[PDB]
Design an enzyme around this catalytic site. Structure first.
Site, PDB file in Angstrom:
ATOM      1  N   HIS A  37      16.240   5.364  24.317  1.00 31.25           N
ATOM      2  CA  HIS A  37      17.005   5.723  23.317  1.00 31.25           C
ATOM      3  C   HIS A  37      18.405   5.313  23.496  1.00 31.25           C
ATOM      4  O   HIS A  37      19.443   5.718  22.844  1.00 31.25           O
ATOM      5  CB  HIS A  37      17.091   7.048  22.511  1.00 31.25           C
ATOM      6  CG  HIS A  37      15.658   7.545  22.369  1.00 31.25           C
ATOM      7  ND1 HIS A  37      14.654   6.951  21.155  1.00 31.25           N
ATOM      8  CD2 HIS A  37      15.139   8.676  22.447  1.00 31.25           C
ATOM      9  CE1 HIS A  37      13.632   7.509  21.095  1.00 31.25           C
ATOM     10  NE2 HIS A  37      13.749   8.437  21.939  1.00 31.25           N
ATOM     11  N   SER A 103       8.258   5.629  22.264  1.00 29.87           N
ATOM     12  CA  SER A 103       8.861   6.823  21.208  1.00 29.87           C
ATOM     13  C   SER A 103       9.574   6.113  20.221  1.00 29.87           C
ATOM     14  O   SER A 103      10.596   5.552  20.540  1.00 29.87           O
ATOM     15  CB  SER A 103       9.664   7.909  22.145  1.00 29.87           C
ATOM     16  OG  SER A 103      10.204   8.849  21.171  1.00 29.87           O
ATOM     17  N   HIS A 122      13.993   1.732  15.925  1.00 30.08           N
ATOM     18  CA  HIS A 122      13.717   1.299  17.254  1.00 30.08           C
ATOM     19  C   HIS A 122      12.580   1.958  17.704  1.00 30.08           C
ATOM     20  O   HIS A 122      12.224   3.118  17.538  1.00 30.08           O
ATOM     21  CB  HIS A 122      15.050   1.240  18.228  1.00 30.08           C
ATOM     22  CG  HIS A 122      15.511   2.373  18.693  1.00 30.08           C
ATOM     23  ND1 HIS A 122      16.572   3.147  18.336  1.00 30.08           N
ATOM     24  CD2 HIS A 122      14.713   3.238  19.572  1.00 30.08           C
ATOM     25  CE1 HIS A 122      16.861   4.266  18.860  1.00 30.08           C
ATOM     26  NE2 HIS A 122      15.599   4.341  19.563  1.00 30.08           N
TER      27      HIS A 122
END
EC number: 3.4.21.97
Length: 212
Positions: A37, A103, A122
């Site tokens: 992330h 994830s 994303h």
């Protein structure tokens, strides 16, 4: 050159119901792939997401020339032994062993707010550790990266390859500094590997080359 990644982002009957996923697909723009992330840390992109019976399933491209070197350094000098391998193959082993899960980032919506095409932001690829995401598979071509998921419907399978083959992101190259990638990629291993082996089997995903 590019390598490819695939997986179920979630499983309908194990946050994401069929209704939510319907409202979110196809995404309002392509989704980047990143490490954990971290923005400024894009290494690829989701070429497609379909709505398979079992769950939403992606096919992505990874293509960051600096990544393999930095991975290879993490793992350190002794890892490959006698094995004679290309750069492409080395990277696939390294992705498979150090970023084995993913994830999806979904936007937290306010109560009152209805899911829509901007919901999915994303797909992080997740470095092995305290917490493992959803299982993914890497390989040299899109077909090979999807092939281990034998339960993927044929409808979703073709649709996914068709969509992916006309993604405007199929040929991109993502450059990352070594410093950026180095921060991104820093007993706990042995344990997490059993979990990953376990989740792989639970998902139907078996190999001899990159998977086990």
């Amino acid at each position: 050159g590019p390598v490819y990644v695939s997986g179920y982002l979630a499983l309908y009957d194990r946050a994401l119901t069929r209704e939510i996923v319907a409202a979110a697909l196809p995404p309002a723009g392509p989704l980047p792939i990143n490490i954990d992330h971290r923005p400024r840390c894009d290494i690829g992109a989701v070429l497609a997401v379909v709505d398979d019976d079992r769950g939403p399933f992606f096919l992505g491209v990874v293509n960051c020339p600096q990544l393999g070197a930095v991975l290879a350094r993490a793992v350190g000098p002794d890892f490959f032994g006698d094995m004679r391998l290309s750069d492409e193959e080395r990277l696939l082993y390294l992705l498979s062993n150090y970023l084995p899960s993913a994830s999806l980032s979904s936007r937290r919506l306010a109560p009152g707010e209805a899911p829509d095409e901007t919901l999915f932001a994303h797909v992080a690829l997740c470095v092995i550790g305290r917490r493992v995401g959803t299982i993914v598979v890497y390989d040299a071509s899109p077909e090979a990266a999807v092939a281990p998921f034998r339960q993927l419907s044929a409808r979703a399978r073709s649709e996914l390859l068709a969509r992916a083959a006309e993604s405007p992101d199929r040929e991109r190259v993502w450059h990352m500094s070594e410093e950026a990638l180095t921060r991104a990629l820093l007993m706990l291993l042995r344990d997490r590997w059993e979990l990953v082996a376990a989740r792989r089997r639970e998902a139907g995903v078996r190999g001899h080359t990159y998977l086990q």
